Structure 1
């Protein structure tokens, strides 16, 4: 499913993402936008290390979910990577929260650093009623 901007903003707010570990909703929106264009079915294969980024937040199989095909990988979110391609994003949100409950926080995603860090993200939640 490809979410509409405000549809997603309210979806993430209902899931407890607004201010989660200090990260405003707008930052999560900016992340989803740049990672997948708000597409829950987005996947990206990394030929170099044989891992795959899954879903709306493009969570990587080397550390976060299990896909059975990434050598020496772990599964910190304790989920099948399949859970990260669901139209319903509750599992992906639980995993994204897990990701930020680590040393870097929202910085774990390079995309956030490139297109969201120190830029205006309020535009992503404008008019969404959040």
Structure 2
């Protein structure tokens, strides 16, 4: 499913993402936008290390979810990577919450550093009523 901007903003707030571990809703929106373009079925294979990024937040199989084919990987979210390809984003959100509970926080995604960090991210939530 490809979410519309404000539709996603409202869904994320209801799932308790606003201010989670100090991360504002607009930051989560900026992350989803640059990671998948708000697309829940997005997958990206990394030929370099044999891992795959899954879903709206593009969560990596090396540490967060199990897909069976990634070498010496972990599954911190205790989920099949398939769970991160559903239209219902509850599982993806629960896993994203787990990722930021680590010391790096939102910095775990290099895309956030490149496209969101130190920028005016207000635009991602403007007019959405959140």
Same fold (TM over 0.5): yes
Task: Give 1:15 deviation, angstroms.
Answer: 0.2
Task: Give 1:68 deviation, angstroms.
Answer: 0.5
- Runs of 4+ displaced beyond 6 Å: none
Work out the CA distance in 2 between the residues paired with 1:123 and 1:47.
34
Alignment of 1:1-130 (within 5 A): 1-130=1-130
- For residues 8-40 of structure 1, the C-alpha deviation after alignment (integer angstroms, 9 at most, x for no partner) is 000000000000000000000000000000000
Q: Number of residues paired by the alignment?
A: 130
Unaligned runs of 5+ in 2: none
- For residues 43-98 of structure 1, the C-alpha deviation after alignment (integer angstroms, 9 at most, x for no partner) is 00001110000000000000000000001100000000000000000000000000
Task: Report the aligned-residue RMSD.
Answer: 0.3
Task: Give 1:3 deviation, angstroms.
Answer: 0.2
**TM-score, normalization: structure 2?**
0.99
Work out the CA distance in 2 between the residues paired with 1:103 and 1:24.
17
Task: Give 1:2 deviation, angstroms.
Answer: 0.3
Unaligned runs of 5+ in 1: none
